[PDB]
Design a protein around this ligand. Structure first.
Ligand SMILES: O=C(NNS(=O)(=O)c1ccccc1)c1cccc(-c2ccccc2)c1F
Ligand SMILES: [Zn+2]
Length: 272
């Protein structure tokens, strides 16, 4: 009765939440999605027919990042409305709190793919308001279940701050965050701030760290509080840490997986 399982590419994936695909699509045992254009179909036969006809082998929009077989496409919701609506309905399967599926024109979408000889395979994405009155640099961020906890979420969160740096602005993801999203941001912020605290020593203020990382002062403070690296003096949070305590944190299992890194040399983008 609601969609509860999808087939996309070589994966079958169970749903986590309701998504408002048309009612008729929910009635089927599975929903079949083209992994390139994201069209959703009701039958294995209409899916197989589509696979032989469809000419897409990557997302639409512009490839703004490519390094080896990792790529990011920027897709404006006004230029590619149907693709973006399809992506939003797919994402809502895994996001409890996303509420926008059809009115995609105010958004830009950054689609992460991993490329082989067959084409560019969607891993996840994040959406971002073209104009955010609140300074949100991510609206929703979703990594499909088979790629979760494998470094792709870390890449996309880093990528989102790389755009913010290019815009000379700080940014924070729109709340509420998902459960995975919270853990992932907390770990990313800790990593970035600890690595900057290692490389300086260093007369870095919180404002300094915000300008260097595009992480907001508030998210830096809440992170530094969770690491017990801040003292408070007459109304001001101030950094307080030894080089050694910084290394103790970084030696921990959390920060030991080799990251897929965002190479600024491979990013092609300027503020619109
Ligand atoms: O994969 C993830 N994080 N794990 S990760 O290895 O990339 C990572 C992230 C940050 C720090 C360290 C490791 C990840 C990161 C952000 C969002 C989601 C997500 C949220 C709701 C529904 C579906 C997915 C994630 F799954
Ligand atoms: Zn297709």
């Amino acid at each position: 009765k609601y969609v509860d399982k999808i087939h996309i590419g070589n994966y079958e994936i169970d749903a986590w939440y309701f998504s408002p695909f048309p009612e008729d699509y929910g009635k089927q045992p599975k929903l079949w999605l083209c992994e390139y254009c994201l069209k959703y179909m009701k039958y294995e036969k209409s899916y197989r027919f589509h696979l032989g006809q469809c000419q897409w082998r990557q997302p639409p929009g512009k490839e703004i990042y490519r390094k080896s077989n990792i790529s990011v496409h920027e897709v404006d919701g006004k230029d590619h409305k149907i693709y973006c609506q399809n992506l939003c309905l797919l994402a809502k399967l895994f996001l409890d709190h996303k509420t926008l599926y059809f009115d995609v024109e105010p958004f830009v979408f950054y689609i992460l793919t991993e490329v082989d000889r067959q084409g560019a395979h969607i891993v996840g994405y994040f959406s971002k308001e073209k104009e955010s009155p609140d300074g949100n640099n991510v609206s929703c961020i979703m990594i499909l279940p088979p790629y979760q906890r494998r470094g792709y979420g870390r890449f996309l969160i880093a990528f989102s701050y790389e755009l913010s740096k290019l815009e000379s602005t700080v940014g924070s993801p729109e709340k509420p965050l998902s459960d995975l999203g919270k853990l992932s941001y907390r770990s990313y912020w800790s990593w970035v701030l600890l690595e900057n605290l290692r490389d300086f020593r260093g007369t870095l203020s919180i404002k300094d760290l915000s300008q260097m990382t595009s992480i907001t002062q508030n998210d830096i403070i809440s992170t530094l509080q969770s690491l017990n690296m801040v003292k408070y003096w007459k109304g001001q949070h101030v950094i307080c840490v030894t080089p050694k305590l910084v290394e103790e944190h970084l030696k921990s299992a959390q920060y030991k997986k080799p990251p897929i890194t965002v190479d600024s040399v491979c990013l092609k983008w300027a503020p619109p």
